[PDB]
Amino acid sequence: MLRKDIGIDLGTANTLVFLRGKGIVVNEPSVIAIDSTTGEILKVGLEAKNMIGKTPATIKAIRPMRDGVIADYTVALVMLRYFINKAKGGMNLFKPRVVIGVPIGITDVERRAILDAGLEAGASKVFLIEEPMAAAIGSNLNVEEPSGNMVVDIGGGTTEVAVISLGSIVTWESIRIAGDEMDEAIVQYVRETYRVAIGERTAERVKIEIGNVFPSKENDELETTVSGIDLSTGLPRKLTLKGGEVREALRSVVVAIVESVRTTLEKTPPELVSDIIERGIFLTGGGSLLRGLDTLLQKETGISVIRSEEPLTAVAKGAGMVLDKVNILKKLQGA
Numbered sequence: 346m347l348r349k350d351i352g353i354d355l356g357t358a359n360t361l362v363f364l365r366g367k368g369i370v371v372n373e374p375s376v377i378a379i380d381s382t383t384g385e386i387l388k389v390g391l392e393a394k395n396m397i398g399k400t401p402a403t404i405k406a407i408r409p410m411r412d413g414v415i416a417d418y419t420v421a422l423v424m425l426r427y428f429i430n431k432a433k434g435g436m437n438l439f440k441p442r443v444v445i446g447v448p449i450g451i452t453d454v455e456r457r458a459i460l461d462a463g464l465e466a467g468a469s470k471v472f473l474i475e476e477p478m479a480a481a482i483g484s485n486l487n488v489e490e491p492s493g494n495m496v497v498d499i500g501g502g503t504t505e506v507a508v509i510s511l512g513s514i515v516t517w518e519s520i521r522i523a524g525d526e527m528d529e530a531i532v533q534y535v536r537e538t539y540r541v542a543i544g545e546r547t548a549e550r551v552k553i554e555i556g557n558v559f560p561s562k563e564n565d566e567l568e569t570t571v572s573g574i575d576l577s578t579g580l581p582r583k584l585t586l587k588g589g590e591v592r593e594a595l596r597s598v599v600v601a602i603v604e605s606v607r608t609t610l611e612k613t614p615p616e617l618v619s620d621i622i623e624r625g626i627f628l629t630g631g632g633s634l635l636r637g638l639d640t641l642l643q644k645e646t647g648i649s650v651i652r653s654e655e656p657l658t659a660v661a662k663g664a665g666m667v668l669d670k671v672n673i674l675k676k677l678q679g680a
């Protein structure tokens with residue numbers, strides 16, 4: 346169409362862009378690298394992420410999104426626009442309709458922020474959409490139906506657990522503890538235990554290469570190495586971390602995630618629980634990819650837990666699909 350329909354997943358880690366009629370057309374890190382002095386945009390997306398932690402003092406790589414919402418406005422807006430444009434296929438004649446996914450536990454203020462940043466980013470109409478709602482839609486689960494559907498979305502910034510029914514959220518919990526809060530634990534684990542400082546990115550790699558949360562032979566045998574600075578000798582050092590240590594280091598966070606899942610269920614009308622029980626808890630979100638998280642989750646709850654088919658792209662998909670799911674689009678907040 347002359348007016349492209351965009352579903353935007355503006356996350357703190359990755360920003361996915363869905364385009365009605367063609368699938369996923371933008372899929373890159375929510376990072377912006379500028380010139381620390383002039384204020385010029387150098388690169389955005391993957392090229393800017395690779396910059397993080399390896400930049401001079403004359404460059405500032407910024408993660409404008411923090412904890413699901415806009416941490417640095419004008420920066421977020423500038424990023425939101427690039428990604429939107431890169432998607433639009435190039436300046437169209439008519440401003441697109443945008444559905445940007447947001448976390449459930451967002452204040453009225455953090456809300457208008459994204460609504461205003463969606464308009465300044467060049468959009469005709471902007472709707473907001475709870476992330477786990479889109480996540481569910483973006484997986485073809487019938488959210489319009491009157492039957493419980495529990496979703497556990499663990500992104501880079503926030504962990505949202507939602508119980509969905511009749512096109513809307515019945516109960517939920519949203520902690521600001523997820524993917525990024527995990528990297529740090531790992532980073533701080535190496536610092537505090539091996540007295541060696543590593544980078545936010547080597548940690549992410551560790552989180553991704555051997556991140557697990559359930560004790561098993563396969564897992565315990567896992568190993569990768571980290572190269573940083575030995576804070577005891579100020580000498581570049583390279584040490585080896587085993588899966589058992591990472592699991593243990595991610596514990597504190599893994600527990601918060603689990604606690605909020607428990608809490609949520611505890612306050613869900615029994616009729617839904619009866620459903621969720623036979624149906625299963627849905628696990629999605631980049632940060633939910635930890636090894637054995639479903640097993641662990643399924644254990645603590647006692648309910649089958651099912652990993653999504655495509656977690657990284659489940660919100661972008663939904664946010665865009667909710668456009669042709671008009672019975673649900675009516676209940677969203679717009680601008």
Ligand SMILES: Nc1ncnc2c1ncn2[C@@H]1O[C@H](COP(=O)(O)OP(=O)(O)NP(=O)(O)O)[C@@H](O)[C@H]1O
Pocket residue numbers: 354355356357358359360412413476499500501502503504523524525549552553556630631632633634635636656657
């Ligand atoms: N294989 C993996 N194992 C564990 N964690 C991973 C893995 N792959 C990616 N991640 C992490 O997941 C986070 C991003 O998850 P993602 O679903 O893209 O969320 P987000 O949209 O960026 N943020 P949010 O606003 O919380 O939805 C980053 O912290 C990644 O390090």
Ligand SMILES: [Mg+2]
Pocket residue numbers: 354356498500630631656657660
């Ligand atoms: Mg997500």
